[PDB]
C-alpha cells in the first residue's frame, strides 16, 4: 500500500529524471541534462515546491515535466497522507 | 495531537535548517550557510512554495532538502488540516 506508493513515486522520479536528460540533451543551453541534477529537478517538481535552478527548455522535456507532475504529485501525496495517518493513529 | 504536529514541524524546520548550513558550508558559493537564512529556506520548502532565493548546491544538502520536504510537508499539512477543522467545527 504505502511501500507500493513510495516505490511508484521512486519509479516516477527515476522515470522522469531519465526521460528529462534524454528529452533535453541537444538543446544548446539545456541545464537539465545529467541524471543526478535531472533527479533533483524531478523531486522538487513532485513536491510542488518549484525552486527554479532547473527546468525543461524543450517541448518534449515539458511533456516529461507534466507526467512527472501528474504521476509524481499524486504518488508523493500518498506518502504525505501515509505519514499523516501514522502520526494520527499513534498520538 | 495538533500541538504535537506543530512541534514535529518546528523540530523538522530546526533539524533541516541545522543540517543544511552544516551540509552546505565548504562548497564555494553556497548561499545556504547561516541558520537564520537556512531557516527561511526550510519553512519555504515545507510550505511547498519554492521562492528560489535559496537552495542547496551540494548533494548532502539536497539529501537534507528531501527529508525536509518529506517530513516537513506532511507535518505542515497537519497544521493546515488542524486549522481547517477549527474553522469547520466553528462557523
Amino acid at each position, epitope marked *: 500500500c504505502a511501500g507500493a506508493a513510495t516505490v511508484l513515486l521512486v519509479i516516477v522520479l527515476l522515470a522522469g529524471s531519465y526521460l528529462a536528460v534524454l528529452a533535453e540533451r*541537444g*538543446a544548446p*543551453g539545456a541545464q537539465l541534462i*545529467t*541524471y543526478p541534477r535531472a533527479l533533483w529537478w524531478s523531486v522538487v517538481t513532485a513536491t510542488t515546491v518549484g525552486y527554479g535552478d532547473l527546468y525543461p527548455v524543450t517541448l518534449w522535456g515539458r511533456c516529461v515535466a507534466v507526467v512527472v507532475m501528474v504521476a509524481g504529485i499524486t504518488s508523493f501525496g500518498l506518502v504525505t497522507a501515509a505519514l499523516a495517518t501514522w502520526f494520527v493513529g499513534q498520538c | 495531537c495538533a500541538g504535537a504536529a506543530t512541534v514535529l514541524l518546528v523540530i523538522v524546520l530546526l533539524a533541516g535548517s541545522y543540517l543544511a548550513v552544516l551540509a552546505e558550508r565548504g562548497a564555494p*558559493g553556497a548561499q545556504l550557510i547561516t541558520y537564520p537564512r537556512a531557516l527561511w529556506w526550510s519553512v519555504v520548502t515545507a510550505t511547498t512554495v519554492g521562492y528560489g532565493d535559496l537552495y542547496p548546491v551540494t548533494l548532502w544538502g539536497r539529501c537534507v532538502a528531501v527529508v525536509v520536504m518529506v517530513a516537513g510537508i506532511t507535518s505542515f499539512g497537519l497544521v493546515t488540516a488542524a486549522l481547517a477543522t477549527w474553522f469547520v467545527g466553528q462557523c
Partner: antibody, heavy 117, light 107 residues
Framework: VQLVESGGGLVQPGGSLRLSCAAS????????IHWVRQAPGKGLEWIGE????????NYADSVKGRFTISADTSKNTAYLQMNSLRAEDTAVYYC???????????WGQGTLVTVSS | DIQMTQSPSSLSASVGDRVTITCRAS??????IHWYQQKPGKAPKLLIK??ESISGVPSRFSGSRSGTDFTLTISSLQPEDFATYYC?????????FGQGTKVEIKR
C-alpha cells in the same frame, strides 16, 4: 571495462567512412557513448553523443547533420557514419563512455581518419 | 556556447615544484567541470571530477576554487606529468573542453 574502436584510415574529400566502438566490459543500460576528436596538435572537440537504449544521437553544429551516430545494443557497439568529409575532419576520433554524470570515465584507443585528394 | 578559457597554454616548471592550471568558464557553470590528463598519442585520462578525485589518481593532483576560475594543481611536479591537461564543462548542453595546457618539465 574498456572500449575498442574499428575502421578509419584515408578518404577522398566528400568521401565516406564508418568508425566503431565495441563495448567490452561491464556495460549499464543507460550510458551515452560519445565521440571526441583531435586535429594534428589541436584541442579536443566534443562532436556527438548517443543513448544506445532509445537510440537518440545529438551532434555538433561544427559537424552539422553531416555525420550520423548508430547504436546496435545487439553488438554492444556504436558507430560514427561520416558523410561529406572535409580537409578539416582530418583528425583522430576517440569514443568515450559517460554515465549521465558528464565526464568521460573510459576512452577507446582512438583512430586516424585522414582526408586529402 | 560555454567558453572554458584554460590558462596558460605552456608551463616550463621544475620537478617537485608547485604547478597550477586555471580554467575560466564564460558563465557560472556550477561545480560541473572535470580535468583530463592526455599524454602524447594516448586518450584523455580523467584526473578530477566535480572540481573530487578518481580511483588511482596520484595525490599531487587536487582541483579547487569556483565561480568561473577552476584550478587543477600539481603540488610537486613529477617526471611522468609531461602531458597536456584538459578542462570540461557539463553545466549546459553541449559539453565543451578548454584550449588545453601543455606542461614541460625543467631540469
Amino acid at each position: 571495462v574498456q572500449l575498442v574502436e574499428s575502421g578509419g584510415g584515408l578518404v577522398q574529400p566528400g568521401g565516406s567512412l564508418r568508425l566503431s566502438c565495441a563495448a567490452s566490459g561491464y556495460t549499464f543500460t543507460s550510458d551515452w557513448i560519445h565521440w571526441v576528436r583531435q586535429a594534428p596538435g589541436k584541442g579536443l572537440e566534443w562532436i556527438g553523443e548517443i543513448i544506445p537504449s532509445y537510440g537518440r544521437a545529438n551532434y555538433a553544429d561544427s559537424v552539422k547533420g553531416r555525420f550520423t551516430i548508430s547504436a546496435d545494443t545487439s553488438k554492444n557497439t556504436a558507430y560514427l557514419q561520416m558523410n561529406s568529409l572535409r580537409a578539416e575532419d582530418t583528425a583522430v576520433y576517440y569514443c568515450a563512455r559517460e554515465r549521465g554524470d558528464g565526464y568521460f570515465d573510459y576512452w577507446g584507443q582512438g583512430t586516424l581518419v585522414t582526408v586529402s585528394s | 556556447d560555454i567558453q572554458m578559457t584554460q590558462s596558460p597554454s605552456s608551463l616550463s616548471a621544475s620537478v617537485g615544484d608547485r604547478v597550477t592550471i586555471t580554467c575560466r568558464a564564460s558563465q557560472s557553470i556550477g561545480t560541473d567541470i572535470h580535468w583530463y590528463q592526455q599524454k602524447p598519442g594516448k586518450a584523455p585520462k580523467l584526473l578530477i571530477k566535480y572540481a573530487e578525485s578518481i580511483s588511482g589518481v596520484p595525490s599531487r593532483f587536487s582541483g579547487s576554487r569556483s565561480g568561473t576560475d577552476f584550478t587543477l594543481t600539481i603540488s610537486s611536479l613529477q617526471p611522468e606529468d609531461f602531458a597536456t591537461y584538459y578542462c570540461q564543462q557539463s553545466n549546459r548542453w553541449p559539453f565543451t573542453f578548454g584550449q588545453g595546457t601543455k606542461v614541460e618539465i625543467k631540469r
